[PDB]
Amino acid sequence: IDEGDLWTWRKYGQKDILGSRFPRGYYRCAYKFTHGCKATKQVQRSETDSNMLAITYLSEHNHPRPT
Amino acid sequence: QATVDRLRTQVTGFLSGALGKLQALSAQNMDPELAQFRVLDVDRAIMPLLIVAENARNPGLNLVPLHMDMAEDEEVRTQPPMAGSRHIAEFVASARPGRYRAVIDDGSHTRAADIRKDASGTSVIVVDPLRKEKDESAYVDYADNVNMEFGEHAKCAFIPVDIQKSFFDCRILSLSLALKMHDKDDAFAAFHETLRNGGDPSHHVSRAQQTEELGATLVLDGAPLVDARMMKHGQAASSVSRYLGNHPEQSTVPVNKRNETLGERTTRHLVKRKVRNRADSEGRVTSGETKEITFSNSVEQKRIALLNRAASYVNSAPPPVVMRMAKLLQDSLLD
Numbered sequence: 328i329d330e331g332d333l334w335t336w337r338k339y340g341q342k343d344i345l346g347s348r349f350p351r352g353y354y355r356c357a358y359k360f361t362h363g364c365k366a367t368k369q370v371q372r373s374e375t376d377s378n379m380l381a382i383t384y385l386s387e388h389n390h391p392r393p394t
Numbered sequence: 395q396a397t398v399d400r401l402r403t404q405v406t407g408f409l410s411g412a413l414g415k416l417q418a419l420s421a422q423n424m425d426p427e428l429a430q431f432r433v434l435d436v437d438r439a440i441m442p443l444l445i446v447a448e449n450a451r452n453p454g455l456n457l458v459p460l461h462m463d464m465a466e467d468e469e470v471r472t473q474p475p476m477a478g479s480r481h482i483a484e485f486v487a488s489a490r491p492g493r494y495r496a497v498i499d500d501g502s503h504t505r506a507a508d509i510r511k512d513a514s515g516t517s518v519i520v521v522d523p524l525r526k527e528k529d530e531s532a533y534v535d536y537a538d539n540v541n542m543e544f545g546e547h548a549k550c551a552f553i554p555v556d557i558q559k560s561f562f563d564c565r566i567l568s569l570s571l572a573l574k575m576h577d578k579d580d581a582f583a584a585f586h587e588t589l590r591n592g593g594d595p596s597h598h599v600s601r602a603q604q605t606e607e608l609g610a611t612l613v614l615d616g617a618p619l620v621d622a623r624m625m626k627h628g629q630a631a632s633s634v635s636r637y638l639g640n641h642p643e644q645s646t647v648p649v650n651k652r653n654e655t656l657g658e659r660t661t662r663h664l665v666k667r668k669v670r671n672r673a674d675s676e677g678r679v680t681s682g683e684t685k686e687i688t689f690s691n692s693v694e695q696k697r698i699a700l701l702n703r704a705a706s707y708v709n710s711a712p713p714p715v716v717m718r719m720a721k722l723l724q725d726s727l728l729d
């Protein structure tokens with residue numbers, strides 16, 4: 328619960344998951360439409376250790392960091 | 395290579411077996427997840443079969459399974475798209491003009507849609523049985539997402555509804571929603587026309603606005619288009635009564651031939667039982683692997699009824715239909 332990203336994101340999904348007490352959140356880049364950016368990320372509070380956040384980033388941003 | 399009889403037997407047998415387990419589970423008031431029954435897999439496998447059957451049972455339903463980009467990403471998706479599913483963009487590029495219903499798999503979640511395609515373009519009205527975002531502004535994003543998969547020039551409405559409370563019931567709920575869309579074919583057609591003409595949607599739905607980036611119509615309250623009959627499988631009594639409290643005119647209409655109102659029918663389906671403990675709206679969860687809740691059975695019963703219908707259909711279907719369904723099942727079980 329100290330998430331931080333050099334990027335900007337919009338929501339894609341938010342759903343409960345098999346075997347987990349905590350829901351998974353799905354995000355895609357704020358520049359998906361304007362720049363065709365393919366970068367996505369998934370965020371889910373860890374089942375085993377409730378203090379830990381699991382985050383997966385997929386594909387690379389096709390633009391510099393939003394300054 | 396096998397006979398029509400054998401294949402027919404393998405398809406109805408699959409459906410009957412699913413039915414046997416689900417009916418046992420329901421009769422014993424057991425949660426499938428806790429009972430370690432693989433609902434996700436079975437739902438995924440039966441859905442193409444249900445769609446074939448419902449399409450035959452209701453000429454003009456024209457239901458098609460579609461999926462989005464994420465559904466093709468092995469690293470993100472919860473499971474592969476169902477057998478025979480087509481990418482949204484391939485469908486909008488190639489389908490004959492006409493009126494379709496769809497179940498749309500986004501990789502993790504399935505929604506219902508009513509699609510109109512003609513020479514002047516495509517419009518889609520998406521109804522999501524899940525409304526889990528605390529912050530409603532989030533749905534702007536969702537609306538934009540679906541729009542950009544149908545293409546910028548497609549007109550799109552996105553309507554999230556608070557029906558689903560479980561992690562797995564989206565497919566059956568979406569199937570049911572599509573049946574209801576067909577049932578209300580005229581009202582959805584009227585909304586399509588309004589989307590295409592860029593007209594005032596406030597005559598069709600209660601809360602609506604266009605998104606800034608794609609101009610999609612986000613509908614944060616779909617009544618009266620989303621009517622009482624579309625809320626019948628709402629799993630939380632609190633969701634159903636909140637709906638009825640918001641739209642009292644919906645509280646007096648019969649939602650079936652037994653002349654039950656929505657409220658009455660929902661209370662009849664209330665059961666109490668143990669499910670996996672999961673976080674609530676503000677992400678708080680108690681200790682222990684389970685919690686006891688009270689919720690409506692309706693979707694469970696629906697799945698069972700749909701399976702009965704499909705088995706019945708297959709039992710007497712002509713050989714080409716049997717061969718198509720056998721290939722759909724075979725391709726499903728490949729996962």
Ligand SMILES: O=P(O)(O)O[C@H]1[C@@H](OP(=O)(O)O)[C@@H](OP(=O)(O)O)[C@@H](OP(=O)(O)O)[C@@H](OP(=O)(O)O)[C@H]1OP(=O)(O)O
Nearest residue numbers: 570573574577623626627649650651652653654659692696
């Ligand atoms: O008449 P429909 O609007 O098309 O609804 C039919 C069905 O009809 P039949 O079994 O008689 O042929 C039931 O309706 P009733 O007999 O109770 O009147 C049932 O409704 P219930 O669950 O309330 O009993 C269910 O509809 P639903 O999913 O809304 O619950 C079902 O299937 P379809 O609606 O998909 O056609």
Ligand SMILES: [Zn+2]
Nearest residue numbers: 356364366388
């Ligand atoms: Zn980006």
